[PDB]
Every structure is written in structure tokens, then in C-alpha cells.
Amino acid sequence: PPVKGRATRQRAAVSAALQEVEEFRSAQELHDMLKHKGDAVGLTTVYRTLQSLADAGEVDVLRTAEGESVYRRCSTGDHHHHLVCRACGKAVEVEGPAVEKWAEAIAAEHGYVNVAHTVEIFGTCADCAGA
Amino acid sequence: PPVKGRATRQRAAVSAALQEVEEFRSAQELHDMLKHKGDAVGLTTVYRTLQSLADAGEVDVLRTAEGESVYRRCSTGDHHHHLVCRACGKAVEVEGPAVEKWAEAIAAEHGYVNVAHTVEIFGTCADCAGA
Ligand SMILES: [Zn+2]
Ligand SMILES: [Zn+2]
Numbered sequence: 001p002p003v004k005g006r007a008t009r010q011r012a013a014v015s016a017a018l019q020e021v022e023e024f025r026s027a028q029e030l031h032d033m034l035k036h037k038g039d040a041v042g043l044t045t046v047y048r049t050l051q052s053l054a055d056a057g058e059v060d061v062l063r064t065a066e067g068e069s070v071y072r073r074c075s076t077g078d079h080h081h082h083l084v085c086r087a088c089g090k091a092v093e094v095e096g097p098a099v100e101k102w103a104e105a106i107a108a109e110h111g112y113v114n115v116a117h118t119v120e121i122f123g124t125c126a127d128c129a130g131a
Numbered sequence: 132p133p134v135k136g137r138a139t140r141q142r143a144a145v146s147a148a149l150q151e152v153e154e155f156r157s158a159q160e161l162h163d164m165l166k167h168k169g170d171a172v173g174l175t176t177v178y179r180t181l182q183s184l185a186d187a188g189e190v191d192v193l194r195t196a197e198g199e200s201v202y203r204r205c206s207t208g209d210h211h212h213h214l215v216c217r218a219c220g221k222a223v224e225v226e227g228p229a230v231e232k233w234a235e236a237i238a239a240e241h242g243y244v245n246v247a248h249t250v251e252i253f254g255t256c257a258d259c260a261g262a
């Protein structure tokens with residue numbers, strides 16, 4: 001995930017950490033991980049970097065049930081939706097044109113100019129139920 | 132909107148005020164409106180009663196983009212999704228089987244025991260363009 005500004009070891013470290021994992025996580029958890037592996041990088045620095053990348057769209061954003069935003073470097077750059085298990089944190093890339101067509105149809109029927117859609121599905125794995 | 136607690140003027144007042152308004156609004160906005168109407172009801176009371184109503188299912192909850200939460204009352208008791216214009220705040224309820232079928236298919240394919248899908252979509256309405 002390239003950054004608009006000059007690359008620095010802190011930005012490179014947070015980018016390497018983002019590509020290292022595949023689950024959703026907020027600024028605090030990733031700050032904990034990077035400090036523990038030996039990065040020594042700031043909280044506000046990672047917050048600003050994540051804001052910048054979200055503006056660039058290289059990563060995705062998702063507001064949890066409480067409200068805090070979590071982030072994930074998705075392999076697929078095209079339009080897509082994520083199926084997330086809160087117990088595991090795993091994200092599965094799922095895309096469907098049916099929901100997009102439905103959104104466009106209802107927007108046209110209501111005469112709305114633009115449509116921004118948030119479609120999140122929260123569930124639990126089969127292994128989660130098992131013990 | 133019956134409340135599980137005992138009959139009191141606070142619950143009746145907040146329920147009537149919610150029924151009067153048909154727009155998604157935050158707790159502070161509802162508190163200010165109730166104060167202006169002369170209810171003289173507490174903000175913590177508004178929060179507690181609103182949480183109780185949300186748990187009862189008689190009201191529809193929604194999370195704002197920046198992080199706050201807005202709430203609205205919809206006459207229909209059946210499950211439905213909302214189109215909310217951020218510019219005006221007006222919300223209209225709809226229902227389309229396509230999202231349900233896609234969620235069921237995804238759950239069956241991925242083996243998820245249970246899923247909870249949230250589909251709230253945003254778009255500007257006609258009057259925004261009009262000047
Ligand atoms: Zn993705
Ligand atoms: Zn989509």
C-alpha cells in the first residue's frame with residue numbers, strides 16, 4: 001500500500017504489518033502488535049497513516065458493534081463485500097451483483113441521485129458452534 | 132410503544148415524542164426536542180429508555196457514519212431495510228428478497244450456523260439538487 005508522502009520506516013512497518021495479517025483490527029490492536037514485535041511506533045502516527053490509506057482506499061474500513069473502526073488490507077481491489085465472524089475475526093471476500101442491481105433499482109425508483117451502500121453480514125463459523 | 136417497566140410519565144412522554152417524529156435522530160437531539168416541548172426529561176433517562184425500546188424491538192436503530200447512533204420508529208413490524216439521506220436525514224423503509232436469498236446462499240455455502248445481516252444504504256434525494 002503506497003503512501004502519497006515520502007516513505008519512512010514507520011509507514012513501511014505499518015504497511016508490512018497490515019499485509020502480514022488478514023483479520024480485521026483497529027489502531028490500538030495493531031499498535032500493540034507492532035510495539036511487541038519491536039517497531040516502537042506511535043498511536044497517532046498509525047492512526048494518521050490508516051486515515052491516509054483509507055482515503056486512498058488501499059485498505060477497507062468496518063465499524064464494529066460498539067462503533068470503533070477496524071481495518072484490513074484486502075487482497076482484492078475491486079468492489080466486494082466481506083463476511084466476518086466476530087469470534088474468529090476471519091474475513092471472506094464475497095461479491096454479488098444482485099444486491100448492486102437491487103440498490104440501483106430502488107435508487108432509480110425513488111429518484112435518488114447517488115447510492116452508497118453498506119452491506120455487512122455477521123455470522124459464526126461451524127467450528128465456533130462445535131466444542 | 133409499550134415499555135417493560137411500570138407505567139410512568141417519562142416512558143409515555145418519550146414514546147409519544149418518538150412517535151411524533153419520523154426522522155432518524157440521535158439521543159441528544161431527542162433530548163433537546165423534548166426539553167423544548169416542555170417534557171423536562173433527563174438525558175440518561177432518554178438513553179436508558181431508548182436502549183430498552185431497542186432491546187424490545189419496537190424501534191429501529193442505526194449507526195451514523197462518524198460514529199454516533201440515530202434511531203427512528205417505523206410502523207411496519209416486519210423486517211425491512213432503510214434508505215437514509217444524510218443531507219436531509221429522512222429515512223424510508225423497503226424490503227427486497229434478493230439480499231435475504233444471497234445471505235442464505237452465502238451461509239449455506241460457507242457453513243455458517245447463523246448470520247445477522249445489516250443492510251443500511253445512503254443516498255441523496257431529489258430535493259437536495261433542487262435550489
Ligand atoms: Zn476484500
Ligand atoms: Zn457492493
Ligand SMILES: [Zn+2]
Binds near residue numbers: 087088089
Ligand atoms: Zn468463527
Ligand SMILES: [Zn+2]
Binds near residue numbers: 224
Ligand atoms: Zn423501519
Ligand SMILES: [Zn+2]
Binds near residue numbers: 217220257259
Ligand atoms: Zn436529501
Ligand SMILES: [Zn+2]
Binds near residue numbers: 231250
Ligand atoms: Zn434483509
